[PDB]
Amino acid sequence: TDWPVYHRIDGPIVMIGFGSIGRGTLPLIERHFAFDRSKLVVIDPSDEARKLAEARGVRFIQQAVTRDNYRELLVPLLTAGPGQGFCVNLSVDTSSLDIMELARENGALYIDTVVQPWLLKPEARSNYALRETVLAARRNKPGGTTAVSCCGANPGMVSWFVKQALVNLAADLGVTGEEPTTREEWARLAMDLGVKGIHIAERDTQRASFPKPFDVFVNTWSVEGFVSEGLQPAELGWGTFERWMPDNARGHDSGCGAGIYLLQPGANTRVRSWTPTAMAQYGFLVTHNESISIADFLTVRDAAGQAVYRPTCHYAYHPCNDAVLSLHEMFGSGKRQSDWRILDETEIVDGIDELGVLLYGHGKNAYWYGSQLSIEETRRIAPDQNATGLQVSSAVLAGMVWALENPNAGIVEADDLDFRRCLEVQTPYLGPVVGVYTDWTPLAGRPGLFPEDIDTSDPWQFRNVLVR
Amino acid sequence: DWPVYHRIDGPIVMIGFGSIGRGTLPLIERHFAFDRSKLVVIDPSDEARKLAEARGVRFIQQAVTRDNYRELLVPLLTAGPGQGFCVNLSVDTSSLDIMELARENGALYIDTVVQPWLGFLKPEARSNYALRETVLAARRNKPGGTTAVSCCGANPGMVSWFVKQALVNLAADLGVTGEEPTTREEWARLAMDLGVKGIHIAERDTQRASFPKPFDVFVNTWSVEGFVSEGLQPAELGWGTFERWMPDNARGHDSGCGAGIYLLQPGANTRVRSWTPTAMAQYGFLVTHNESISIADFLTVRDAAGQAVYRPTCHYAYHPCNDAVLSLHEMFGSGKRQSDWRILDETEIVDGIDELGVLLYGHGKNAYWYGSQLSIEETRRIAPDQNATGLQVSSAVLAGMVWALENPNAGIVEADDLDFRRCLEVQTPYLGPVVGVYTDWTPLAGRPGLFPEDIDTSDPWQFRNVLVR
Ligand SMILES: NC(=O)c1ccc[n+]([C@@H]2O[C@H](COP(=O)([O-])OP(=O)(O)OC[C@H]3O[C@@H](n4cnc5c(N)ncnc54)[C@H](O)[C@@H]3O)[C@@H](O)[C@H]2O)c1
Ligand SMILES: NC(=O)c1ccc[n+]([C@@H]2O[C@H](COP(=O)([O-])OP(=O)(O)OC[C@H]3O[C@@H](n4cnc5c(N)ncnc54)[C@H](O)[C@@H]3O)[C@@H](O)[C@H]2O)c1
């Protein structure tokens, strides 16, 4: 009845970054893998991180990993032996692709939760473009040591939820038969079910024991990371059903073809969305890797290679109340707050991180599938983190298990992993995982007091979702 | 001790006993001498009844409606022996109809808002410009007569007196010579000569509650029903002659004073870039307010032909308390009102201020904020039964009442028509720090930035730059 130990790691474990996610992932690595304790080392420039690592009894190197030092630092650490090591990258300000390629070159497994560069026109700031660098790297060097790109809660877990949700939608219609095996089969299942689009539909209700301080940005995970992505252009996977886009929307000349972006910051762009606890709510259209990767994954092309079916996919994020206030403060002031803080589990009085996928446009209108993990449950089952952190760290755990079980798979996205195996590892840490149908649409209660440019023939059009 | 300004020798009829009525009644008892059993409070709610009974004040548990207001109020207003005073602090009642009833029965009248009877509409008809035009027409139809003070709370109300004092201060600091204005035409000419392109009613409420905001509860420091109703009205502003651009969904008015436009979107979901001393640069919401129109109208200069050659832009730039910001996000994101609401009591507020002032911009010193920084701690020391928001309003009602008793045959008047020095002399003891602050901030601070924006770089204070689009 104790915790399962999934695998032995026969080489160094190098954790890059020991912020909110690193702190939550370390205890799960220790819990679920067998290895000599001295094999693990944490790298992070922060004094705060150093003091926590010392209290946890783990090796700690207080250094920022940079383009200038990453080869001389990471190659010896990852190749120390006797066997294959694992690079666990949970940092800000480091090049995911460069570290990934270095790990592969040296036979070390690799996982991260984001594609980002080393510490510029808007299209270059896009997660579409960054994802294209990873796809190109895979084409240049197929196969080889497994490296898992963007395997956190979102991007990451939500790709597995999309697959489970598609299977459930079919079953709820009385459609029986083997589930898809190939990418094209998954894409055709979405097409055949009439899925028009998908929101990554999230509502964080975690509340702090102190009121939000003036001129302090407050969040339940990285403030630096959230602000960085929130200032990037709004970004979405763009569905074939869409008949309207804003005047300030732009596409891409190259790549998989699945994305557009808007010439405005994602964290100041609102969309109409829905989760089970929030019901109808505003989300922020913050750019995310999975907005592109899920739309790409579910694309059906004709013989000529043109996409004839693709779902819309984007984030619709309602963060914790203090983060909502922090965004209002930041954008209203035109500048970042002087200080910031990430809520510790000891500072959260109650709440959940409700994180799921909202598939819409099919015969049952809309279906939300995801996790309702509470802070109370989090504290009972995993230390050193809040409910936001545990969804992410447990997804990293699942990706690490998959990579150790499938060590010769090359560069892979969350959409490439065995979703059933990953969810089997992750689900002890997700609290209630539920599927909920709703009849809500973005046109509920509309038109109202004022004229609006809506498309009443198709309630889920982005024209109706975007707050204008 | 506290000054007793005057005796009131007739009935005092208070319509509405919510957050503002509860804050105003103690000031009335404190600052006027009157037969105490001559005060009557009318409110439909049981909560109001219990509070009035606890004070031993006559109470009538009725909702004033178009169907009953004549039969209900006339006996109360004319009960004698002397001139009565109708103090209207309610939601859901016709300001104009009750004002006219008071006037034709010789009773003084004051309120803090122009609003219609609760309905059992074209966007233009929902505008405060239209509502104010019904009051202006009433004045033209019955000049002079018994005084009725329209829209004399904190804003609208006190901020009109702040605008006059700020113009005086700017004149001194910019070396503009001339005697203090004493007529509307002289005030308007002073604003023109100072180069005041526009005015924000620039407010930041930092009052914080001892409990976190509950899900599906709208929280505010004053009327939730009243704030939501005004926040769903069209965004609305006095429209200055310097403006070179208006949004595609802006509209004007065929008739009336000519000072206003409105936008075909709700004010409480419309953001503007603004500034207060404690907030520094912030978003405010462009909630419609009577003074947006009245201040712009008051400061209009016309040529001989009657065409406006100068007028300041004027509008609200409201940053309410944090729990109200979250309540608006919740309400607009859900597309419907929350199932419950609450107004923060002073006992529930841990700290904070209601920073309420006027931001005059476009002149030689860029921008100037003048107003009140009243804290909840100071409020509790000097006045009972209210928070810092309520006390700024209730003290303004007091000031207007003192002015009306000293000027009881002035006809229908707005806060812009009162003697601002006398009103501020009555109100200032309840306003805490009242300060003027210059800033170099403009709406183009930091702009253009990461993304292309439709800005006017020739003039930072253009509405094109202020409006969040
Ligand atoms: N996919 C997901 O679900 C998901 C969820 C949360 C976060 N993330 C990603 O992970 C990132 C980290 O999140 P977090 O909440 O732990 O952030 P955090 O801000 O709490 O921690 C970041 C850590 O990185 C360290 N760091 C900074 N520069 C470094 C360098 N050059 N080398 C090594 N370490 C460095 C900092 O000292 C800090 O301790 C986020 O910015 C985000 O991109 C992904
Ligand atoms: N000018 C200003 O600065 C300013 C400031 C605050 C409020 N106001 C105005 O004053 C109004 C009242 O403010 P509040 O905070 O006291 O509101 P509130 O919601 O606390 O109280 C309103 C009261 O009116 C009563 N009421 C409802 N229908 C009625 C009717 N038909 N007849 C008589 N009473 C009735 C309610 O029972 C309630 O007690 C607001 O809606 C707003 O328009 C103006």
Author numbering:
A (entry chain B): 2 to 120, 128 to 476
B (entry chain A): 3 to 122, 128 to 476
From the paper:
Bacterial HSS is mostly found in α-proteobacteria and in some β- and γ-proteobacteria, including pathogenic strains such as Legionella pneumophila, Brucella spp. and various P. aeruginosa strains, including PA7 and PA14. It catalyzes the conversion of two molecules of putrescine (PUT; 1,4-diaminobutane) into one molecule of sym-homospermidine [HSP; bis(4-aminobutyl)amine] as the main reaction along with several side reactions. Bacterial HSS is NAD+-dependent, active at neutral to basic pH with an optimum at pH ∼8.8, and shows increased activity in the presence of 50 mM potassium ion. BvHSS forms a dimer, with each subunit containing a boot-shaped substrate-binding pocket between an NAD(P)-binding Rossmann-like domain and an HSS-like domain. The cofactor NAD+ is bound as a prosthetic group in the binding pocket with its nicotinamide ring being part of the active site.
An ‘ionic slide’ (residues Asp94 and Glu117) was proposed to lead positively charged amine substrates from the entrance to the binding pocket into the active site. The activity of these BvHSS variants in relation to wild-type BvHSS correlated to the negative electrostatic potential of the exchanged residue in the order D94N (61%) > D94K (52%) >>> E117Q (1.5%) > E117K (inactive). The deeper lying residue Glu117 consistently had far more influence on the activity than Asp94 at the pore opening. Due to a lack of interpretable electron density, large parts of the ‘track-and-trace’ loops are missing in the BvHSS variant E117Q (residues 123–127 are missing in chain A and residues 121–127 in chain B). The shifted side chain of Gln117 is thereby moved away from the entrance tunnel and does not cause steric occlusion. In addition, the electron-density distribution of the NAD+ molecule was interpreted as alternative ribose conformers of the nicotinamide riboside moiety. While the ribose moiety in the wild-type structure is exclusively present as a C2′-endo conformer, both C2′-endo and C3′-endo conformers seem to be present in the BvHSS variant E117Q. However, the extent of the above-described structural deviations is rather small and should not exert significant effects on the activity of the variant. Instead, the drastically reduced activity of the BvHSS variant E117Q is assumed to be caused by the lack of negative charge at position 117.
